Design a protein around this ligand. Structure first.
Ligand SMILES: Cc1cc2c(cc1C)N(C[C@H](O)[C@H](O)[C@H](O)COP(=O)(O)OP(=O)(O)OC[C@H]1O[C@@H](n3cnc4c(N)ncnc43)[C@H](O)[C@@H]1O)c1[nH]c(=O)[nH]c(=O)c1N2
Ligand SMILES: Cc1cc2c(cc1C)N(C[C@H](O)[C@H](O)[C@H](O)COP(=O)(O)OP(=O)(O)OC[C@H]1O[C@@H](n3cnc4c(N)ncnc43)[C@H](O)[C@@H]1O)c1[nH]c(=O)[nH]c(=O)c1N2
Ligand SMILES: Cc1cc2c(cc1C)N(C[C@H](O)[C@H](O)[C@H](O)COP(=O)(O)OP(=O)(O)OC[C@H]1O[C@@H](n3cnc4c(N)ncnc43)[C@H](O)[C@@H]1O)c1[nH]c(=O)[nH]c(=O)c1N2
Ligand SMILES: Cc1cc2c(cc1C)N(C[C@H](O)[C@H](O)[C@H](O)COP(=O)(O)OP(=O)(O)OC[C@H]1O[C@@H](n3cnc4c(N)ncnc43)[C@H](O)[C@@H]1O)c1[nH]c(=O)[nH]c(=O)c1N2
Lengths: 220, 218, 217, 216
């Protein structure tokens, strides 16, 4: 499962532990019970979501592999209840790719110059910063110093291990119109993979707990 | 599937696991824009991360256990906050008996004025009285959440424990050690055994370079 | 600030870092604007779900509570705890004995006074068995396992206002056990005294429980 | 207490809850004898009883380049509130390394030229950003051309146990020189507020190198 985001980004599912029944099993230990049948198990997921019983959902875990601009990674990495491993800016080899917004990214905004010129101006400063970085590297400046001139739209990569409860909090905050459009796009991809692996939890989440707007207006 | 019996009626059972040693190799190699390599280089990387303190790659390995343990042991266990728990509700569940009765051997090395067999019998006796008092209160309409407060700390509970390998290794450092209570040491030995089966390279490197306790090496 | 709970328990404030203005400063990101504008900002953050500024307000409490209550409390992982050791600490060997009023509303086969007496009686027998084991040379870590769940323990609880408000949402509520709801009312009272604007805005916009809106705190 | 770091950065202490005695009281579960209390701090540090140190909490106000903040914000057992790149007003200041930052490196051009080339690209990126903003481009889009050396500001609330983990990892020669400088300032403030815990930490638990070679 890999979903392309923006001009060069992606969200890829690396691994997953459990499914909707993992939350059913974790919740049923409360009354000294285990699993039952599909209809009763789906009814239990809805019940847990409708009444705020969130801890059973922590037993479902995902590992994603994400390629995203640093300005998006910075917002994402604010979610502390998760595990991260990212490309090292000090020692890693990079692809040196950058997010260049298309003119449509500026639709709705009254700009003094055409949106096409905004796209061109961003490519131009990206090209100059990248060339300056290459000149510094070629002259023996260490990468940890030379890379500080690179713009915030430079692409990075990281592994993200997160349980369904923390993933639903991430979706509440990022799959929402108050979040930056670029991270909303990534949150739609995370929601799509979550829905495929945990359909009952995802449907119950949208029905009872989801506080955002875009997941109820856009089919994922 | 993997199940280890602990104490007289307890157990530790493996419910699920995400990943293996290569999950930590993959997570660490993203730093240099690399992925997996060959068996020898990958095992060498696990030992390198362990000995130099690069712990975050081990968070991408996750386990779910199903545990049955006495409440005095669960109270110590539940202090490990970097993990997920779901436990039996004493407020809303039928009490299916089950208490940890130490065997006479638990008192070996202690000079007691009564035989250790009598200690075992005295513990079974007070457990039986507390349990029947609890049943009498329940039968008379006292809610479970009030009636259960008379039950002793050796009553068995059950719980699901979801924990990543980094937090699991912190748990082993603290509990798979002679300073921890013998009863939780037994449970930590079962946790270590299952971890070793699923992540042999991480477990071997952990014992060799990072493990601070004593009993796993004995 | 100390508030008595149950028959022998308490919640006592040990220390506090910050007040309502600590959340205002964190939200504006400035170590340096008008009481009305600052109170308006607290209500704005509470009403729109901007929770992280409230993490910069921290409390330390000293709690004396029965073990069954402490087990429920210690499920709140986003906090710091230090508790009396069951293996090595000296204990007062006090126990929570519910008063007959705890059984009001329940149709019991025996008078609620008899339930109170039966609980004190099994507590006394368990305590005497524990003493017999200790006197015979059984270590405390083994002998104490016969003690009932109503035995009082003590702990330090260091928690920030965001995690404290999650605790109030879950424990200052009729679905939580009455015994922990009493402790959560005391925590709410101390929180209100130290952070009146955050507490008032919390009740008005974010609080999901019932009892803090029905009982004067 | 405010300490200047780099060319335009700083670490400032906003608030603190407790001192060494907060860990002593937490360990004993009790709410004064200097020698016995200091002996207890060393005992806990030496035997790995870390949880009593969580009852000491600090709030700092930090101004640091984004490349340093990204490394810092990897410490999840802490609270942060940062300037919003999407909506906040900014000073628009940037870390320009001085020629001394390139000491020991064999460069094909003088280290002074590296400093000049960095100031030059920063100035061009900043001017491009201003041109976009002036033409109506939202800040959340225009800001993506700004370099990683742009200074951000944040509040950091962290307990002493997590702060000691941060010092173990960042007040060390394997960490990037820039974040080592900030970790030295944090160590200095921590030492002033918790002298016994800081000294016991260096003696028994500290795994880094620079705090045992440099007086803070
Ligand atoms: C639209 C928008 C706009 C902004 C921001 C977010 C969004 C969605 N943020 C980021 C925000 O403050 C926060 O850092 C992230 O949304 C992460 O949210 P959580 O803390 O809920 O997730 P996280 O994954 O960190 O934690 C998950 C849950 O665990 C709990 N938790 C974790 N750590 C805790 C702690 N130490 N104390 C208490 N509870 C804790 C909480 O219950 C939380 O919901 C922000 N930030 C900023 O600094 N300045 C800004 O201007 C903005 N702007
Ligand atoms: C010199 C150097 C070099 C690098 C890095 C760090 C340093 C010091 N890092 C960053 C590193 O992976 C890590 O994110 C930070 O050092 C934060 O460290 P902690 O997780 O210990 O602190 P943090 O404050 O996040 O946690 C504190 C403690 O809580 C525990 N903990 C917190 N959350 C946990 C969780 N979910 N599960 C288990 N335990 C948890 C651990 O005990 C930890 O010590 C890195 N990163 C990277 O991605 N790529 C890189 O190349 C590098 N390079
Ligand atoms: C009325 C009632 C009834 C019950 C229970 C609670 C209540 C209020 N519980 C306890 C419940 O499952 C939970 O352990 C506590 O209420 C603690 O709540 P939080 O996890 O929200 O707080 P906590 O302080 O642990 O966490 C604060 C916040 O951080 C986040 N968080 C922290 N750690 C996280 C993690 N690892 N992953 C994801 N997010 C994380 C969440 O956002 C959370 O709200 C329960 N329990 C049970 O096992 N069986 C039962 O029968 C019951 N019954
Ligand atoms: C032999 C023995 C004896 C005792 C105890 C333990 C052991 C092993 N304890 C329990 C002890 O205080 C602690 O609660 C547990 O060992 C859990 O340890 P961690 O915090 O390491 O794990 P946990 O799983 O909670 O955390 C994992 C890691 O995350 C980090 N971490 C998590 N939350 C954090 C926070 N809020 N701030 C900073 N870092 C955080 C740390 O790096 C920690 O190593 C104790 N307790 C007690 O109160 N009284 C006692 O007498 C004893 N006795």
């Amino acid at each position: 499962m890999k979903i392309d985001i923006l001009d060069k980004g992606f969200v890829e599912l690396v691994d997953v532990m459990g499914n909707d029944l993992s939350a059913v099993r974790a919740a049923r230990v409360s009354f000294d019970m285990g699993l039952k049948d599909e209809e009763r198990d789906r009814h239990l997921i809805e019940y847990l979501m409708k009444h705020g019983h969130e801890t059973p959902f922590e037993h479902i875990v995902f590992t994603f592999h994400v390629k995203a601009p640093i300005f998006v990674a910075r917002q994402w990495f604010r979610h502390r209840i998760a595990s991260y491993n990212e490309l090292s800016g000090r020692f890693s080899k990079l692809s040196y790719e950058f997010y260049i917004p298309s003119p449509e990214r500026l639709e709705g905004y009254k700009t003094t110059i055409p949106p096409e010129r905004v796209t061109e101006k961003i490519s131009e400063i990206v090209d100059k910063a990248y060339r300056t970085y290459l000149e510094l590297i070629e002259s023996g400046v260490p990468r940890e110093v030379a890379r500080i001139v690179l713009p915030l739209n430079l692409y990075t990569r990281f592994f993200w291990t997160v349980n369904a409860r923390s993933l639903m909090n991430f979706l509440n905050l990022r799959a929402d119109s108050h979040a930056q459009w670029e991270i909303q796009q990534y949150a739609l991809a995370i929601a799509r993979i979550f829905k495929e692996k945990c359909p009952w939890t995802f449907e119950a989440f949208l029905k009872y707990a989801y506080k955002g707007d875009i997941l109820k207006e856009v089919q994922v």
